[PDB]
Amino acid sequence: DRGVNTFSPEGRLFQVEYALGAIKLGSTAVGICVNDGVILASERRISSTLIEKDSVEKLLSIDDHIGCAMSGLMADARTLIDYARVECNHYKFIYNENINIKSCVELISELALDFSNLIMSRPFGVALLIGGVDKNGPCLWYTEPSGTNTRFSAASIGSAQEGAELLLQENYKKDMTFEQAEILALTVLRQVMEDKLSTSNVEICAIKKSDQTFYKYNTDDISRIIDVLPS
Amino acid sequence: TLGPVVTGTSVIAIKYKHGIMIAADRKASYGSYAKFQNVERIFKINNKTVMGFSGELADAQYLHELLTRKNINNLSEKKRKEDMYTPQHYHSYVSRVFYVRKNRIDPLFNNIIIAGINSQKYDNNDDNVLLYTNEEYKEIHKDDLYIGFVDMHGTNFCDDYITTGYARYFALTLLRDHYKDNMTEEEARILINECLRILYFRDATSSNFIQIVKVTSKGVEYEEPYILPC
Amino acid sequence: MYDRHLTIFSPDGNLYQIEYAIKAVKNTNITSVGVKGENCAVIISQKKMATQYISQDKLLDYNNITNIYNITDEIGCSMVGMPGDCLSMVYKARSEASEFLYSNGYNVNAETLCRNICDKIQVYTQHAYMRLHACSGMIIGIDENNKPELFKFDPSGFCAGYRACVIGNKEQESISVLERLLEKRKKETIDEDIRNTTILAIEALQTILAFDLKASEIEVAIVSTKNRNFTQISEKEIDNYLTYIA
Amino acid sequence: AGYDLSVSTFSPDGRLYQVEYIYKSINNNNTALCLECKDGIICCCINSNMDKNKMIKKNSYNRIYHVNNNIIITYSGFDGDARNIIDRARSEANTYYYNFHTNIPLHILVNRISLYIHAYTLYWHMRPFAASIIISSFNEKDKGDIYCIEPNGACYKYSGIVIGKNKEMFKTEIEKKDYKDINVRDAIEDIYKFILTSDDHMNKNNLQNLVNFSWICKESSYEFQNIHEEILTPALNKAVEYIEK
Amino acid sequence: YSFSLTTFSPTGKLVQIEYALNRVSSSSPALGIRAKNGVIIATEKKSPNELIEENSIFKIQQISEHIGIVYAGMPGDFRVLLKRARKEAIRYSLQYGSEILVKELVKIIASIVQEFTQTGGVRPFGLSLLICGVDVYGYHLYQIDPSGCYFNWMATCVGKDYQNNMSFLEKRYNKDIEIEDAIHTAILTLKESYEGVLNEKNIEIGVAYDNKPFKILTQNEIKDYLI
Amino acid sequence: IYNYNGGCVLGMSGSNCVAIACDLRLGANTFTTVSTKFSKIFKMNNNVYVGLSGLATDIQTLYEILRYRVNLYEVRQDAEMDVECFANMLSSILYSNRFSPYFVNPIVVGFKLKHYKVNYEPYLTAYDLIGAKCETRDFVVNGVTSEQLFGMCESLYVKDQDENGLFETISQCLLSALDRDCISGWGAEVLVLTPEKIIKKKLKARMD
Amino acid sequence: RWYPYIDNGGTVIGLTGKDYVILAADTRLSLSYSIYTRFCPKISKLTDKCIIGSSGMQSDIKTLHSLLQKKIQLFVLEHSHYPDIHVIARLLCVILYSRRFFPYYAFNILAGVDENNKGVLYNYDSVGSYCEATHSCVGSGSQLILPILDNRVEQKNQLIKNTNFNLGDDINFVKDAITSATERDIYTGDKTLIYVIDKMGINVNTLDLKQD
Amino acid sequence: TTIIGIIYDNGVMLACDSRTRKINRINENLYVCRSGASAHSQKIIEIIKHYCVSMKNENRKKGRFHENLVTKNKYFYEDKFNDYNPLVENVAHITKKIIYTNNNFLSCALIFGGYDKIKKQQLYAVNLNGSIIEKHDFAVSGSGSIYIQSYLQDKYKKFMTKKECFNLILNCVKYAMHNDNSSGGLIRIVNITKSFVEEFTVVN
Amino acid sequence: NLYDTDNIIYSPEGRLYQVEYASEAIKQGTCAVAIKSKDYVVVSGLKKCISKLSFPQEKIFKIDDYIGISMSGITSDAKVLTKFMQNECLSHKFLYNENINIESLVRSVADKYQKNTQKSSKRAFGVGLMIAAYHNEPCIFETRPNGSYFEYDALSFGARSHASKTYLEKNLHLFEECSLEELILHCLKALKCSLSSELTISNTALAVVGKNHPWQEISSLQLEEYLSKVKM
């Protein structure tokens, strides 16, 4: 009926708004940024028991010092992640230093609007919660199909993102310790699941300030965090 | 593009009080034939800038169309006198052109001088410009003046006096011996005439039928060509 | 649905865009007549503006208006239709004539030029993103055999020869006029027959249009063997011819 | 009935409505007048729609441009489409001088510009230009040569033309007398009076911060020159004094 | 932006090609006969006003020394098809150094017509060519359509009332017919088809007499045949 | 460059009988051979044969190009292809790489059909490495050993001849030519085509 | 038959310390056996705590320095922090190797002070290889000065040894070295610019050499 | 090859040799005499004639305005007042552009001659490479013109008659033919004036 | 009604609806305001903050020394335009070693607006730029989705711009010939009028550029001092 790049009477692009509709469904994920580092997590929406659950992974690494958490159309998300890590390694080749997270999300947003001729064919329909550490300090960032990127102390994406933002607003406080951040993330995540929290039912990653290195928590660390989790 | 055929000799450019003075012999030699003894070798881009030439004539003509039409485009998008482009702009433009042609290996067999006045606080000629058809001189600080050079290889610099060709041995020596600052028009023209006399007496490719051009507050002044006193 | 918006065949086998462009040419209400005799060929048209929103104002140099252009020294043309389309058509004709001279070394023939412009019009008809050029016209010239030639083309791309033809409104009614005057002629010096052909053209336009044809409001041109070049005749000489007709 | 959705479609009556809509847009836009005189030509532009914008500087918005410093070019319509056409005119003049080492004749330049504008009214994908352009020059031998290209792609020579809003009353004042014998300097009175009369949006205070001027006459040695305020304000004061009486 | 304006409808049938055949059926008729020692292409031209000359318009053309062609439809389509067919014969002669076969030319023009049916941003050709020629393998007569499909005939007719002209030509035709009798049957067939009165400059004929060049008859020879 | 893989071809005509012959050598570094079966003759049609002499890779590449073009022509026309058409097409292919050419000097040998019954006219021609065609009407020779073959044929050609005498003539001419060339020889084959049949025979040559 | 390569000639001297770096260069441009001008600085400031010097073709070093300043300014605009000297070194390495087959006639020295207050010094060839050093020199006089710097800084083939070095002695050593080069090489120069970098910004002085 | 061009009063003359028709008619008011390689010169002559026909068509206004043997031909101009004939500066400068853009291959020295309303009789000398100089006195090219350079310098006057320039240019080409080895045959001369051009050849 | 399917179709009134919708997208954007005096152009804007955990978005951007912009509309389009202008100024200073003429840059970006409005299968940018610079004179320019640009003494973009414009034309005469401090104060009054719900150090942006004053955002302490002065 209309083209991809047709403005609405209200000045909004139809395809961009429909892409915003697509990210409203998906796996819930939560991010927290504190002085000692950054934390990301996902509800790990497991399919039937015949799936391995190792291949189905929601927390990938753009680089050694950057994590991510996806939402929406996932194949489009892997395409964006692949382009992001390629450009970050291009920075690492052209410049010795590690790329800042702001530049990475700016490049990701630049690719996301490539369908508007100003090649791709439509918006990507992906929301990312990128997190990392650099010389400026630890931070996390939000991305959406409209190209605007906003920088957060704590956020969430996916299906139950509204309640996750409400609980993060109620509970998050500045000058927080990293252990406080981990238990806060698991409390919010547990409150917004459908199924009971467990070890295989959740995945976590973090990038410490000292290490400046991506590190996905294994089953032992997750169980240790769950055992000291209030209820 | 492949080699010189019809060649000009040399030019001299010096800055003094009230403006600058640039001189050139009107001759282009076809090797050892001297076919043309009345050729315009000093060109004008706009007021307060001129282009020198010592080398192949076709390349200078091509650069003359490029530079003068760049000035035409400047006028066509002009709203105030300060929007006029300075000699630094044109000198950098010729330097970039020579560098690009060097990298492509299709050079220009020329040695250009760009010189003029890089300031607008001394005259109101550029507020209402007069391309086709056309008081007391106002003293100009040497800092507001500019003389530049462009080599085949794109090498460039700036100095109070610049010469090309065989004048880089004779006339440059005379200038380094005798050039002062804020000399009047008569002393500058005497020095230019002495240098060109020494060139005429010891350069085949040069001559005595000299063109002299000045760039002052009044603007570019193509004086009458004169045979040297000798 | 959308059978006639583009250059597409309709259920009856009629590309309706062709007749729409042709009637758009007719709506300009500029008439142009051509005619040939022996060793001459005369072309006439009106010195007016086409019919559109802009009207002829007082501060309009009426001499600059002209429906007769030329392609080459030996070849002339009279395009009738939209102004921009006519200007584009003469430019394309100039292009084909000049590349014909370049490639083949001798000046083009008007028949070949008419076929080439008809082929470009075919290219416009065949494709959809090409709008039709609403510009019919005449071409005249003299061939290598030193005899005259007159050709016509439409927006349909139908090039055909003639010895008398008319462009614009009342063409079907005007065919009888040209046939009558040609039969009258059939019932001569190199210069006298030029005069006979020119009065025949002006009389034909007078009878077709039915008003006085002020010489400032028309324009006449001719190629012959005396000159062989397309030269358009001055106003006073046309006034003398009109007074002879009166 | 669908025939007015694309420029590439002829109507059943054989007529391109999509160009008529462009004409109607041009007629409702800011007006421009350009006429000739003995000494030269003066050409004006009346920016009436920007009376609401009070923060614009004095006479910054100037729709009058030029090529080669001896040909006025201006417009009445979309600024961007006009500016693209101006840049194309500069490009064609540049190509002509690089080829031939001579300034382009104006009568060829208008023809090339008309073909460039006409070349965009025969594709569905390309948008036709929304701008009616006036080109003019003057020299002592051949006198003024004012043309006007249109969206249709028609160039006609004029001795005076107005386009845009209020154009009928402006021309109704221009045929009030013959301006071929009136000098360029004293025609400013007439133009000021006519813009006060025809336009129902300008007053005494709007007259020195919205309307543009330029001439190409003998006083500027037949080259382009935006007019200095010391010439405008005497005639402006006399014109408003006449209108007040 | 390039997409196929021609497309399959329900039940297919290629409606644009059907409209092209409707254009052909309304256009002025043409016909051709294959004889024992020759082949004919003939067509009537509309009764012209006195300003037209038949020495400018030609529905009969020649592609090579031995090959002719006639059409019924849009003239500009026929002009561009004729020019490109001349180019095909020329490139074949440049490669193989001989006059082109009729079958190869018919196949190439059929492929071009199919390409224009299939290609996006275009419409089919609104005519129906009728190519005749002589080569090593005897005489031939072929018929192109807007669909881009060719049929081998020994005698055929195209245009208005083509079914009745086909029936009449079937009534009066023999495999061993002489060339003069074939010309007479062409004249009688077009006379029955026109529903009027004929003469020179109203009809046009082309013929290839044995292994000789393809010949277009002047009005004098046609006037001799009419008597 | 033709010393590398030296070779020779030959073809004569007669009374309703035509002959073509070649050497079976494949060289490498001029003065050491590697095979004694590399036939320069390639059948291409029921009554057309082609003899390619020069660089072996160019011989093979030109054979596949011409076989592609030929089999395309018989499949589309659905009829047998003529010698003149093949000769013109061969000349066009050799010219199509006028710069950086195939280093091969081919020949064409076959029969010309004149339908009316049918008469088989002999046809022979030769080419440069560009396609410089020249109809000859008698013996045609091409290769590094061309001069020796030109010397032999005029002494030994007897105008029209019987197919047996034609075989003796062409065999003796080729064997005497190849014995006087060091880089050409190592056996021979003689193909004698007639409308009724073709006889292919190999000669007891100085293959050593 | 035109060779697009001429050695305009010159020398650039570099020396480091605990928390400073000294870089010195001529101010002469020239041709084979003749001088154009007596003032042509080859040192171009890149950042607040980094400079680059070069020698070879004048046009190539000017284009390279202005291009590198363009890349640095774009880097600051995109990333909101100044680039470190190692970053600039790798960027210049990639820039040089981009023209591998038509290389720049530019032998570069990149001086500055790291974020940890350490005076670094990178030295280059025409193609792009680079290595950190405490002393380097390039240009026509490189063979002359480089043994002297090896004697002073590294101070091998010695037994008594003396590592007590400070900023003034290092500067005076650089003045002695460039004066010796000016005496002992014809392309060297007549006035030289001693750039000095410290934690408290950059300072530049000038010195007058022989005019021959 | 010898090529000579001389400006005299109310006109201009050109000359050549006939050894290998060197003068070529681009337009009625515009003739060009070719020197150098034959093929290069003939190619650029075809191209410049193409360009002249292009601008001659393009600059046409719309409506009505202005209401031994000395065997010779005369060709009066069709266009009076030079209404649409192109300018010789324009054709010479596009020729300069064509030779300059292809100077690596093109090696031909051309001298141009024509009459223009704007600047009257003119004479432009296109050299090897893209160098163009307007000669107000005389122009020379070819091998045979090298020997008559001082003769032309001596016997030239500022405002010469038609007969004076005729005899001077004829003796000039005759002396060049006598001295130079690669020049001979009948001499061709073309006189271009305000209102006509006359072609005449000399067999001596 | 049906003439808003594409950007290449003029309505019967003769209007491009798509370009008007892009202007509507600009008008729904966040606020901004710019002021100039005799030797200073001050720029300010309200940085969007969607949540208390969200931090303020970047509103003001820097393009080149002595040149800067402010934003209102689609942010990705602003990213593209910022990269283009930064590349243009840096390329000019590369090839010519001088600061670019500001109005030539404005014409360049307006040409980029034009070529995307004109051809089909492409969209106009949903953003307008508030360009401020000192090219030997303070200057304020404007861009629109149609190819067009105008020059202002003062300007505002989107949100409650009516209150700001009313304050600016109420006090336009006093902007010329006043010091920089009062200029910053007046700009803050205009932004506070656009608030209508309080101005803080975090949620506002401020930049200054003028004679002997390169483009530099105001620090937190100075901005807090000016905000306290506005409150008093």
Domain boundaries along the sequence of chain D: 1-239
In which element (H, E) is residue I186 found? helix I180-195
Domains of chain H by start residue, with CATH: 1-204 (3.60.20.10)
**Nearest C-alpha in I relative to D3:** I9
Who among C20, C50, C128 is closest to D14 (CB)?
C20
Residue E200 is given by DSSP the state: B
I and B interact (at least 3 Cβ pairs within 8 A): yes
Of I218, I187, I169, I150, the closest CA to residue I32 belongs to: I187
CA distances I157 to A145, E73, E131, I60, I169, Å, are 24, 63, 72, 13, 15
G34 part of contact set with chain B, CB < 8 Å: yes
Just list the catalytic residues of B: 1
CA distance I8 to chain D (A): 5
Q: Per the structure block, which two tokens stand in for H6?
A: 């001389």
CA distances D180 to D139, D156, D183, D190, D225, Å, are 14, 18, 8, 14, 21
Q: How far apart are CA B149 and CA B164, in angstroms?
A: 9
Helix (H, G, I), strand (E, B) or coil at G152: helix
Residue type, H159: F
Q: How far apart are CA I230 and CA I192, in angstroms?
A: 9
Which position has the token pair 């050499």?
G209
Q: How far apart are CA D196 and CA D227, in angstroms?
A: 19
Per CATH, is D1-239 categorized as 3.60.20.10? yes
In which element (H, E) is residue E133 found? strand E130-135
Chain breaks in chain I (C to N over 2.5 A) after: 196
Of B226, B179, B187, the closest CA to residue B207 belongs to: B226
Residue B33 CB: number of other CB atoms within 10 A?
11
CA distance C210 to chain E (A): 22
E96 part of contact set with chain F, CB < 8 Å: yes
Q: Do G91 and A97 lie within an 8 Å CB cutoff?
A: no
Burial (CB count within 10 angstroms: exposed 0-12, middle 13-18, buried 19+), residue A54: exposed
Q: Which pairs count as long-range contacts for F202-206, CB under 8 Å and 24+ apart, including other chains?
A: F203/F171, F203/F174, F203/F175, F205/F175, F205/F178, F206/F175, F206/F178, F206/F179
Q: Resolution of the deposited coordinates, in angstroms?
A: 3.0
Who among A96, A100, A106 is closest to G90 (CB)?
A96
Q: How far apart are CA A13 and CA B23, in angstroms?
A: 65
Domain boundaries along the sequence of chain I: 1-231
In sequence order, which residues have a C-beta less than 8 Å from that of residue F200 and are 6 or more positions away? F189, F190, F191, F192
Residue B190 CB: number of other CB atoms within 10 A?
13
**Nearest C-alpha in I relative to G72:** I90
Burial (CB count within 10 angstroms: exposed 0-12, middle 13-18, buried 19+), residue C91: middle
Is I87 within 8 Å of I79 (Cβ atoms)? no
User: In terms of DSSP bridges, do strands H11-16 and H187-192 run parallel, antiparallel, or are they unpaired?
Assistant: antiparallel
Q: Which of H127, H132, H136, H140 to mutate to test the interface with B (most CBs of B within 10 A)?
A: H127
Burial (CB count within 10 angstroms: exposed 0-12, middle 13-18, buried 19+), residue H163: exposed
Is G85 within 8 Å of G120 (Cβ atoms)? yes
Interhelix angle for H38-58 vs H88-101, to 10°?
130
Largest CA distance in chain A: 56
Kindly give the residue spans of alpha helices, DSSP state H, lying in E97-161.
102-118
Burial (CB count within 10 angstroms: exposed 0-12, middle 13-18, buried 19+), residue A200: exposed
Which position has the token pair 């760049």?
B70
Burial (CB count within 10 angstroms: exposed 0-12, middle 13-18, buried 19+), residue H50: middle
End-to-end Cα spacing for chain H: 17
Q: How far apart are CA G9 and CA G26, in angstroms?
A: 10
* φ, ψ (nearest 5 deg) of residue C19: -70, -30
The D residues from 73 to 92 touching B (CB cutoff 8 Å) are 90
Q: How far apart are CA D183 and CA B74, in angstroms?
A: 31
Which position has the token pair 């497309």?
E7
Q: Which chains share 3+ C-beta pairs under 8 angstroms with A?
A: G, I
Q: Three-state SS across A129-159?
A: EEEEECCCCEEEEEECCCCCCEEECEEEECC
Helix (H, G, I), strand (E, B) or coil at D131: strand
Is H187 within 8 Å of H170 (Cβ atoms)? yes
Q: Which pairs count as long-range contacts for F89-96, CB under 8 Å and 24+ apart, including other chains?
A: F89/E95, F89/E96, F90/F50, F90/F66, F90/F127, F90/F131, F91/F127, F91/F131, F91/F133, F92/E94, F92/E95, F92/F131, F93/F62, F93/F65, F93/F66, F93/F69, F93/F131, F94/F127, F94/F128, F94/F129, F94/F130, F94/F131, F95/F130, F95/F131
**Which residues on neighbouring strands pair with residue B97, listed in sequence order?**
none
Which positions in chain B touch H100 (Cβ < 8 Å)? 1, 58, 62
Which position has the token pair 């027959």?
C193
Q: Per the structure block, which two tokens stand in for F166?
A: 């034609």
Is F33 within 8 Å of F172 (Cβ atoms)? no
Largest CA distance in chain E: 59
How many pairs of residues across C and H have Cβ atoms under 8 Å apart? 40
Domains of chain A by start residue, with CATH: 4-226 (3.60.20.10)
CA distance D104 to chain I (A): 25
E98 part of contact set with chain F, CB < 8 Å: yes
Which positions in chain I touch B89 (Cβ < 8 Å)? 96, 98
Q: How far apart are CA I111 and CA E65, in angstroms?
A: 59
In sequence order, which residues have a C-beta less than 8 Å from that of residue H20 and are 6 or more positions away? H38
Residue D128 is given by DSSP the state: P
Structural domain harbouring E191: 5-227
Q: What is the CATH number of the domain that holds G201?
A: 3.60.20.10
How many pairs of residues across C and E have Cβ atoms under 8 Å apart? 91
DSSP string, I39-77: SEEEEEEE----SSSBPPPP-EEEEETTEEEEEEE-HHH
Residue B175 is given by DSSP the state: H
Q: How far apart are CA D126 and CA E99, in angstroms?
A: 47
Kindly give the residue spans of alpha helices, DSSP state H, lying in chain A.
14-23, 74-94, 101-112, 161-171, 178-191, 219-227
In sequence order, which residues have a C-beta less than 8 Å from that of residue A100 and are 6 or more positions away? A134, A135, A136, G79
Structural domain harbouring C70: 1-246
Residue H100 CB: number of other CB atoms within 10 A?
19
D154 part of contact set with chain C, CB < 8 Å: yes
Residue F176 CB: number of other CB atoms within 10 A?
15
Backbone conformation region of residue H45, classed left if phi is above 0, alpha if psi is from -120 to 50, else beta: alpha
User: In terms of DSSP bridges, do strands F140-143 and F8-13 run parallel, antiparallel, or are they unpaired?
Assistant: antiparallel
Q: Do B153 and G40 lie within an 8 Å CB cutoff?
A: no
Q: Which CATH number is associated with domain F7-204?
A: 3.60.20.10
Q: Which of H27, H53, H85 to mutate to test the interface with C (most CBs of C within 10 A)?
A: H53
Is E154 within 8 Å of E139 (Cβ atoms)? no
CA distance H195 to chain D (A): 22
Q: How far apart are CA B1 and CA B10, in angstroms?
A: 20
Is I160 within 8 Å of D47 (Cβ atoms)? no
Residue F104 is given by DSSP the state: B
CA distances F115 to B103, E212, F118, H137, Å, are 68, 16, 5, 78
CA distance I8 to chain A (A): 12
* φ, ψ (nearest 5 deg) of residue F52: -105, 125
Is D178 within 8 Å of D47 (Cβ atoms)? no
Kindly give the residue spans of alpha helices, DSSP state H, lying in chain F.
56-77, 83-96, 146-156, 163-179
Cα angle for residues I77, I80, I84 (degrees, 5° grid): 140
**Which residues on neighbouring strands pair with residue C70, listed in sequence order?**
C76
Experimental method: cryo-EM
Q: Which of C45, C46, C48, C63 to mutate to test the interface with H (most CBs of H within 10 A)?
A: C63
Is E165 within 8 Å of E32 (Cβ atoms)? no
Q: How far apart are CA I122 and CA I8, in angstroms?
A: 10
Residue I10 CB: number of other CB atoms within 10 A?
24
A93 part of contact set with chain G, CB < 8 Å: yes
Which position has the token pair 């307060």?
B48
Q: Do D55 and I154 lie within an 8 Å CB cutoff?
A: yes
In which element (H, E) is residue D77 found? strand D71-77
Length of chain F: 208
CA distance H129 to chain B (A): 7
Kindly give the residue spans of alpha helices, DSSP state H, lying in chain H.
38-58, 88-101, 149-155, 162-179
CA distance H57 to chain C (A): 7
CB-side exposure of E111: number of CA atoms within 13 Å? 9
I48 part of contact set with chain G, CB < 8 Å: no
Of C210, C186, C207, C208, the closest CA to residue C197 belongs to: C186
In which element (H, E) is residue F200 found? strand F198-202
CA distances G174 to D16, G22, G200, G205, Å, are 82, 8, 21, 13
Which positions in chain B touch I96 (Cβ < 8 Å)? 88-89, 92-93
Is E63 within 8 Å of E105 (Cβ atoms)? yes
Q: Three-state SS across chain C?
A: CCCCCCCCCCCCCCCHHHHHHHHHHHHCCCCEEEEECCCEEEEEEECCCCCCCCCCCCCECCCCCCCEEECCCCCEEEEEECHHHHHHHHHHHHHHHHHHHHHHCCCCCHHHHHHHHHHHHHHHHHECCCCCCCEEEEEEEECCCCCEEEEEECCCCCCEEECEEEECCCHHHHHHHHHHHHHHHHCCCCCHHHHHHHHHHHHHHHHHHCCCCCHHHEEEEEEECCCCCCEECCHHHHHHHHHHHC
Which positions in chain D touch B130 (Cβ < 8 Å)? 221, 223
CA distances F11 to B199, F42, F110, Å, are 79, 13, 10
Which position has the token pair 């020692």?
E37
Radius of gyration of chain D (CA): 19
Which positions in chain G touch I87 (Cβ < 8 Å)? 74
Burial (CB count within 10 angstroms: exposed 0-12, middle 13-18, buried 19+), residue H23: middle
Q: Which of D97, D99, D114, D145 to mutate to test the interface with H (most CBs of H within 10 A)?
A: D99
The fold of the I1-231 domain, in CATH, is Glutamine Phosphoribosylpyrophosphate, subunit 1, domain 1 (3.60.20)
Which position has the token pair 């607008």?
B120
In sequence order, which residues have a C-beta less than 8 Å from that of residue B143 and are 6 or more positions away? none
Q: Per the structure block, which two tokens stand in for E150?
A: 């060719």
**Nearest C-alpha in G relative to A136:** G81
**Which residues on neighbouring strands pair with residue I64, listed in sequence order?**
I67
In which element (H, E) is residue B63 found? helix B57-76
Cα angle for residues H112, H115, H121 (degrees, 5° grid): 85
Residue I204 CB: number of other CB atoms within 10 A?
23
How many pairs of residues across B and D have Cβ atoms under 8 Å apart? 33
Which positions in chain I touch D65 (Cβ < 8 Å)? none
**Which residues on neighbouring strands pair with residue G121, listed in sequence order?**
G111
Domain boundaries along the sequence of chain F: 7-204
I and A interact (at least 3 Cβ pairs within 8 A): yes
In chain C, how many domains are there? 1
Q: Per the structure block, which two tokens stand in for E67?
A: 């090959």
* Dihedral sign, Cα of residue I186, residue I190, residue I192, residue I196: positive
For chain D, counts of helices (H) and of strands (E): 6, 9
Q: How far apart are CA H180 and CA H202, in angstroms?
A: 18
Is H172 within 8 Å of H151 (Cβ atoms)? yes
Q: How far apart are CA E134 and CA E174, in angstroms?
A: 19
